[PDB]
Design a protein around this ligand. Structure first.
Ligand SMILES: *Cc1c(COP(=O)(O)O)cnc(C)c1O
Ligand SMILES: *Cc1c(COP(=O)(O)O)cnc(C)c1O
Lengths: 377, 377
């Protein structure tokens, strides 16, 4: 159970075995069109919102937002950790003005604090992170946007670790760019960044110049996306053909389960794992319980070394992820994509026996029952 | 037989079925390290030259060359067609000065003509296209560089349609960036750009700032590549994990065949197809025979409509590519990757019976024997 689930459904991987398929083939065009619709479905938007699928991943999707910007534009980044900070690292490469709001480690920036800033100063674009993967902290995006919508021209949300697992309502919340990647809660193969654009965002692409480069200017990919939905092949640059076939199959499986059911499963599994961690007497990295993400949980270690924990759990049946925040000593549990109640049982079981052998103060024999209790309901 | 072979060896595709693999997994690191070595092998360079594998394709690799540039730098593009012109389209997005040399349609810029230009004006960077896919014309890279090396700081070669099929000697010819993509003559799945950098190029990355963006700044990927070759996992941004597994398998097959043998096979197959076209009384797009590429041949049609030819060949057993040059009426044959002598026989057979039904003036009964004659030796 890692950041970037390493286990992909077999149906999804097998979908990439289709041969004699290139970017002009009707099989590809159909898979692209289907994925584009699937993006609207998981982000909750009507045909008024424009999906785009581009090469790379969450980072190339984030940088592609420069397609909506002009020199000297003012940007406010609301950063809860590493991947909030990535917006700033990206925008440092561009002729734009950036201000960043940050909270105390492992906490989150309150809607009122964002409201105060956007009311004081004029901002073209506000960047949010739905789930900050470094800390497992979920920002209350609906509440933030409710406060700020009328003060700012554009709102972008990095949903790389939220889309397909947390409630996302891109149209209803009036988001201008909601973006994700193929390999996280969508549970498909890596190599694609995914974006959903509002009418207002689309009008910028269609009517204005921008500070974008070439490969990541969303204007260059738009004819390919519009084309696909009209059943037409187009060429800008060669896309990851087989990765997109795999993506269409992931979306077929997501629609089959149903997005509401998928969200509920993530909520149940995450609450169950958290229950187990608490019953073990382990502390969660996320400071505020209302922001406990349903995809990532950081697990503070008071005595044991997190590397030893990572090495010891793999030889016991589960792979987790390391902690990457100077303020905490921790490891992370990724619980996203196709994660099941049974995975929750195994994760806590493995955590218990690994921490036992490494001398972390825990309450033995309590983890799994706590998990079972939640799943029992 | 299309631009971007649509048929991928089964061994290569199957390699992408490996599950429970992420960017930190030893299986991935090993596949990345192996592909990096494979790049040195097919481009003919010692360990002094630094390989990098990045997301996207030939276009993202091309744009990543901005990592070596500074504002107001002077660039000379030697463009024989569409993909030479792409260098200009990319560089239009950056604060650089660009001059383009072009030849007559279907011709190529002679080493002496590039020499004259680089002596008259001082250029930081010269961009070449090894094989121009739009016309099937191969630029004499060695000869060009022999003339210009002493007059220019940096030389980059787009080998997207040459690497793994044409002789490439990146170190011996003293190229600073030689680049390609995963899906052309390497015959692997799409989604990766590949670069090989000289020590001089590497010193620029290590010691200077640049005009690059974020995702395509080669400085950001360098720690991941150096890491891999030391057997260490690193993270900049998530790479196309399974596409890279497929790439390592392609490289295993290429080393098994041997690169010299692979080049010889392309030479034989291409000469055979050309012999068959000539014997049919068909004219090749490439104006100068010394530049007939071994990966792409353009086929001029005097009477028949190229679209009809494309539609008619697919329902006869082969898919070709359309012509994309305002100066010619033609279709293209892609003959690269895993192409065999038998594919050459089939291609000419299919061309003969398709052109017959469409009223193109040809010499019937002569194509296949001409092909067989060349293979005969
Ligand atoms: C992993 C991640 C990213 C970066 O995505 P890549 O696909 O690795 O470029 C961006 N934002 C968040 C929240 C992430 O978790
Ligand atoms: C196809 C091609 C490119 C572009 O590569 P992508 O993978 O499509 O970005 C660049 N140069 C040449 C010569 C090509 O044939």
């Amino acid at each position: 159970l890692h950041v970037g689930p390493t286990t992909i459904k077999e149906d999804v991987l097998v979908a990439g075995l289709e041969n004699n398929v290139g970017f002009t083939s009707k099989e590809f065009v159909e898979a692209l069109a289907y994925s584009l619709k699937g993006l609207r479905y998981v982000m909750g938007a009507s045909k008024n919102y424009q999906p785009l699928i581009i090469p790379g991943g969450g980072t190339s999707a984030m940088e592609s937002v420069t397609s909506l910007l002009k020199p000297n534009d003012k940007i406010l980044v609301v950063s809860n950790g590493v991947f909030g900070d990535r917006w700033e690292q990206i925008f440092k490469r561009y002729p734009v003005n950036v201000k960043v709001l940050r909270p105390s480690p492992g906490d989150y920036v309150k809607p009122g604090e964002v409201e105060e800033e956007v009311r004081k100063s004029e901002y073209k674009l506000v960047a949010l992170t739905h789930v900050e993967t470094s800390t497992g902290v979920r920002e209350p995006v609906k509440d933030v946007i409710n406060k700020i919508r009328k003060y700012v021209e554009l709102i972008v949300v990095d949903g790389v670790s939220s889309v397909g697992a947390e409630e996302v309502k891109a149209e209803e919340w009036n988001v201008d760019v909601y973006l994700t990647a193929s390999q996280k809660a969508l549970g498909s193969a890596a190599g694609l960044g995914l974006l959903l654009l509002s009418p207002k965002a689309l009008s910028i692409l269609d009517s204005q110049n921008s500070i974008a480069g070439y490969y990541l200017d969303l204007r260059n990919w738009l004819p390919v996306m519009r084309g696909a939905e009209e059943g037409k092949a187009a060429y800008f640059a060669t896309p990851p053909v087989h990765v997109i076939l795999q993506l269409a199959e992931a979306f077929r499986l997501i629609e089959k389960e149903g997005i509401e059911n998928r969200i509920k499963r993530h909520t149940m599994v995450a609450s169950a794992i958290r229950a187990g961690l608490e019953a073990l007497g382990l502390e969660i990295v996320a400071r505020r319980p209302e922001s406990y993400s349903n995809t990532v949980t950081g697990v503070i270690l008071k005595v044991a070394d997190p590397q030893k924990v990572l090495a010891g759990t793999v030889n016991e049946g589960v792979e987790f992820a390391p902690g990457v925040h100077p303020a905490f000593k921790y490891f992370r549990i990724g619980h996203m994509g196709w994660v099941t109640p049974n995975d929750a049982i195994i994760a806590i079981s493995v955590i218990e026996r690994t921490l036992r052998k490494l001398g972390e103060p825990i309450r033995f024999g309590e983890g799994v029952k706590a998990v079972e209790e939640v799943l029992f309901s």
